Design a protein around this ligand. Structure first.
Ligand SMILES: Cc1cc2nc3c(=O)[nH]c(=O)nc-3n(C[C@H](O)[C@H](O)[C@H](O)COP(=O)(O)OP(=O)(O)OC[C@H]3O[C@@H](n4cnc5c(N)ncnc54)[C@H](O)[C@@H]3O)c2cc1C
Ligand SMILES: [Xe]
Ligand SMILES: [Xe]
Length: 455
């Protein structure tokens, strides 16, 4: 409708992307290549008022609203067929202060712009481990990475935000301003509106001692048992994750391990590197290590490596849950399952959290499952679309195969088929509180391309 559209055009100064344009096919592609959808309109916003006009417009037109930060939605939420995509990719600007250890990021930041900005002052705050992830979706659902055991979730360092709500108002939210929303936005998702600015606290982070190695799959049981019990008792400073995968063809690996299923191990000591050297060495021989790399890295460097691969995978499928305890039978399963991995980029990942995260009260934020120390992520990944059924199937026979030991799911790991699963991840009780807040700030469920919260 022209009256509605012309008003939008006048107030908006960000590039427009229409269904026809030469850049349409690229603008609508997201990282998750299995989602192939065609929106009515793509708005690459370049400022806060840009976003406001776009929020109202979609509402007055009855356009379904998709919000996209870095496009990594494993569930494919940041693109739609037949509606509007609010792309904040252009809002990528960042303010720092050495003298205030504070940063202000627009809602479309990629991690690597952010980490770059803070490490300019030898500063950092926890975020994910792969740098081109969008800051937006990551934080909205919670957000962890290397510093999380020491310093908590990204949301655990979040102070204020600027957010555009469905009714087109602009609000600041913090612990003292609309704390109901600030509570809800720390973990609920984009259900409540579009974050245009984020406020954090910053910590000083110098060179960190880091190690990755490749243990033979024969030694899988003892390493994980060692891994799980030791991490039960590991310093907050120690972070140690496991990636089970086909062995990369690296010259550091013996040819007889190339292309064979191995266990990788990535670890680091957030702290003095001298203490680190001692501590990592003590756990590196949980089994016989191969393709051993040790370095002292600026934290920026810790984020960049994730992850070495010569091909970027087009098609992905993920299945994730939490565990309170990993039994021996659980250990045998995953180990049992691994041998079946048949594509070079799919990983069954095993992360151990707790630390600063578990010392935070379960109801203190919208992030549920703090008390669950374990995360497992079954990440099918491949290229050839026709092969979809073979890999896609594997991860389920896995969550499904391993689906008891589990209690929940991380919202930022839901795949495109898990929209109904929104209730077990958050748990019941929390969700009732969330629905009250959504009903106050988004009574109409305008924002439904997320792990959706009905009003
Ligand atoms: C390869 C990979 C690695 C990852 N590693 C980690 C990790 O180490 N730690 C971790 O915690 N998570 C991790 N994640 C999860 C990550 O949070 C999700 O991929 C998430 O979808 C990425 O956010 P995004 O804004 O880039 O994606 P989007 O799809 O654009 O965002 C996902 C959801 O958030 C909404 N949203 C996004 N930005 C905004 C905004 N500014 N305002 C309002 N709503 C918004 C979207 O509409 C959608 O509802 C990883 C994901 C991938 C794919
Ligand atoms: Xe700031
Ligand atoms: Xe992944």
């Amino acid at each position: 409708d022209p009256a509605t559209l012309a008003a939008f055009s006048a107030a908006f100064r960000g590039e427009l992307i229409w269904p026809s344009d030469a850049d349409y096919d690229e603008a609508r592609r997201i990282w998750n290549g299995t989602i192939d959808r065609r929106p009515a309109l793509i708005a690459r916003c370049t400022s806060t008022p840009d976003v406001v006009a776009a929020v109202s417009f979609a509402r007055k037109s009855g356009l379904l609203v998709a919000v996209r930060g870095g496009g990594h939605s494993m569930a494919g939420h940041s693109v739609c067929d037949g509606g509007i995509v609010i792309d904040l990719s252009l809002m990528n600007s960042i303010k720092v202060s050495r003298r205030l250890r504070r940063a202000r990021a627009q809602g479309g930041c990629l991690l690597g712009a952010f980490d770059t900005a803070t490490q300019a002052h030898m500063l950092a705050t926890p975020a994910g481990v792969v740098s081109h992830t969008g800051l937006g979706g990551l934080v909205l659902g919670g957000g962890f990475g290397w510093l999380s055991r020491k310093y908590g979730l990204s949301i655990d360092n979040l102070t204020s935000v600027e957010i555009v709500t469905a009714d087109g108002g602009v609000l600041t939210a913090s612990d003292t301003e609309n704390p109901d929303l600030f509570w809800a936005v720390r973990g609920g998702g984009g259900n409540f509106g579009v974050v245009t600015a984020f406020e954090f606290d910053l910590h000083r982070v110098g060179p960190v001692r880091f190690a990755s190695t490749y243990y033979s799959l024969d030694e899988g049981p003892q390493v994980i048992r060692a891994w799980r019990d030791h991490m039960a008792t590991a310093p907050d400073e120690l972070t140690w994750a496991l990636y089970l995968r086909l062995a990369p063809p690296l010259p550091e690996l013996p040819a007889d391990m190339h292309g064979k299923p191995v266990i990788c191990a990535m670890s680091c000591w957030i702290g003095d590197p001298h203490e680190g050297e001692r501590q990592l060495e003590s756990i590196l021989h949980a089994g016989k290590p191969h393709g051993l790399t040790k370095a002292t890295l600026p934290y920026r460097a810790l984020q960049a490596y994730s992850f070495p691969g010569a091909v970027v995978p087009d098609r992905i499928y993920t299945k994730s849950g939490y565990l309170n305890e990993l039994s021996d039978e659980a250990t045998d399963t995953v180990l049992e399952h691994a041998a079946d991995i048949a594509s070079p980029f799919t990983q069954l990942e095993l992360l151990y959290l707790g630390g600063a995260v578990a010392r935070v009260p379960d109801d203190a934020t919208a992030y549920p499952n703090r008390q669950s120390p374990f995360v497992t992520n079954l990440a099918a990944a491949w290229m050839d679309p026709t092969e979809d059924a073979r890999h896609t199937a594997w991860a389920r026979e896995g969550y499904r195969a391993l689906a008891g030991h589990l209690s929940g799911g991380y919202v930022n790991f839901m795949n495109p088929g898990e929209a109904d699963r929104t209730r077990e991840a958050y748990g019941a009780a929390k969700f009732e509180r969330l629905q009250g807040v959504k009903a106050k700030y988004d009574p109409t469920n305008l924002f439904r391309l997320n792990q959706n919260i009905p009003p």
